Write a protein that binds this ligand. Structure first.
Ligand SMILES: C=CCO[C@]1(C(=O)O)C[C@@H](O[C@]2(C(=O)O)C[C@@H](O)[C@@H](O)[C@@H]([C@H](O)CO)O2)[C@@H](O)[C@@H]([C@H](O)CO)O1
Ligand SMILES: [Mg+2]
Ligand SMILES: [Mg+2]
Ligand SMILES: [Zn+2]
Lengths: 224, 219
């Protein structure tokens, strides 16, 4: 199994610097070119640069958009790819992906990482408040029941939300966060058979990496 | 520079139907020596990393369903999807690799399906939020189509627009529906001045709004 895993994304101020890393496994690192690609929220993919393989002397090329400002390097001992970013600006806020590139036989980006989110801003890190969403005490409970979690007032993105540590995935809707005066808020709904709640537990698991926040919020009925 | 353009910007197709999309390069991508066109297509599903579908213009990557076909040469290229499936919802990007790499702007493919009415649920503020002095009332509108929908909040029978936050999900990869969350945020002080809290959904699927309500005094 091939593995590409980006790290290092987070909040940085305008003018500042940030280095990202991409740890790889499941293939012979030195045989491959590696690329970095970014994607501002809701916008198109942008190729940033590559570093060539062993046969090609590990040489680098860059997009004009970042040349002279971004530097790519690689640790061939550990099979790690790096992206050093300097003099960051708002337009650099984006998800950053590493991707396995050319092997010299094939024109194609075969394997991509999950991506790491960089936010360039002066706003401070704020952990979320996590509130349970249970039907009110005039809920006429019926066949199915919808529960939720409100993840309010955090910065920067992202947060992750799961239900019962991942056991509940179907019937889940996690709504994209929206920014309102310098803080994000999102919500997540989950829908289950009434027979299973509150008889069985339903818990939302929320994480906010920028504040190392980990929250498990049990949804408890308002009577019951 | 090699400039890559795609069209359309977006479109919607029903399951079972054919999809066609185009990618243009400002200069030929055909390498004289290797006689291949250095043009690839990627699929990026909602919330996922891009996946390679086609390279060298027409070579299908192993694992990629046969219904995806790349064609074209030189400066003009086409991705065709036959018998489109709900799961094919995604943004499709072309990418040149003739001279370094450049991506096109993407084509957003949405799925058309039969109209479906929303399921609406309303939630009072939690005691944990109220303790802190705040009060958010949340309304979920789940699994509807088309995306267009109108939500109004009524407090004691009167519409309130200030303090509302709306968010739509991407289309569902399975049932091709949308969902929306609407959150009304008040201070605890304002919340406790009023009784009736209502979220009303109007959608083309009915001439009557779907109404969910609660009374604070009865919580
Ligand atoms: C055409 C002359 C030499 O090019 C190659 C070759 O083997 O023919 C390929 C070069 O590869 C790249 C590159 O810049 O590294 C990447 C490929 O994706 C592709 O874009 C080609 C492009 O078609 C070539 O013009 O370029 C590179 O390996 C190159 C050596 O580095 C040259 O010494 O050899
Ligand atoms: Mg040019
Ligand atoms: Mg749904
Ligand atoms: Zn009032």
């Amino acid at each position: 199994e091939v593995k590409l895993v980006e790290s290092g994304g987070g909040l940085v101020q305008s003018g500042g610097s940030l280095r990202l890393s991409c740890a790889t496994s499941g293939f012979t690192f030195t045989d491959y070119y590696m690329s970095w690609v970014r994607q501002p929220p809701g916008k198109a993919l942008e190729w940033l640069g590559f570093i060539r393989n062993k046969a090609n002397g590990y040489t680098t090329e860059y997009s004009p958009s970042v040349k002279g400002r971004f530097t790519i390097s690689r640790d061939n001992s550990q099979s790690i790819l790096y992206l050093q970013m300097n003099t960051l600006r708002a337009e650099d806020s984006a998800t950053y992906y590493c991707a396995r590139d050319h092997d010299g036989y094939y024109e194609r980006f075969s394997y991509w990482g999950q991506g790491t989110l960089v936010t360039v801003s002066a706003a401070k890190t704020t952990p979320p408040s996590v509130y349970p969403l249970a039907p009110g005490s005039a809920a006429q409970t019926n066949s199915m029941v919808t529960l939720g979690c409100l993840v309010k007032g955090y910065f920067p993105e992202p947060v992750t939300v799961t239900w019962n540590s991942g056991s509940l995935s179907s019937g889940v809707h996690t709504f994209p966060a929206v920014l309102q005066s310098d803080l994000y808020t999102l919500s997540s709904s989950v829908t289950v058979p009434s027979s299973t709640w509150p008889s069985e537990t339903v818990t939302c698991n929320v994480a906010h990496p920028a504040s190392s926040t980990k929250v498990d919020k049990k949804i408890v009925p308002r009577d019951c | 520079d090699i400039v890559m353009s795609q069209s359309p910007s977006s479109l919607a197709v029903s399951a079972g139907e054919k999809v066609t999309m185009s990618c243009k390069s400002s200069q030929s991508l055909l390498n004289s020596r290797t006689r291949k066109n250095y043009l690839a297509w990627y699929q990026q599903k909602p919330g996922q990393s891009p996946k390679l579908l086609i390279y060298w213009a027409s070579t299908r990557e192993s694992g990629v369903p046969d219904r995806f076909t790349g064609s074209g040469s030189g400066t003009d290229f086409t991705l065709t999807i036959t018998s489109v499936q709900a799961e094919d919802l995604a943004v499709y990007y072309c990418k040149q690799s003739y001279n370094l790499r450049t991506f096109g702007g993407g084509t957003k493919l949405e799925i058309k399906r039969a109209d479906a009415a929303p399921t609406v649920s309303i939630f009072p503020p939690s005691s944990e939020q109220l303790t802190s002095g705040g009060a958010s009332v949340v309304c979920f509108l789940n699994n509807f189509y088309p995306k267009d929908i109108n939500v109004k909040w009524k407090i004691d029978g009167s519409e309130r627009q200030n303090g509302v936050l709306n968010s739509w999900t991407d289309q569902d990869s399975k049932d091709s529906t949308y969902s929306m969350s609407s959150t009304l945020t008040l201070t605890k002080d304002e919340y406790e001045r009023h009784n009736s809290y209502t979220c009303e959904a109007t959608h083309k699927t009915s001439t009557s709004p779907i109404v969910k309500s609660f009374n604070r005094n009865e919580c």
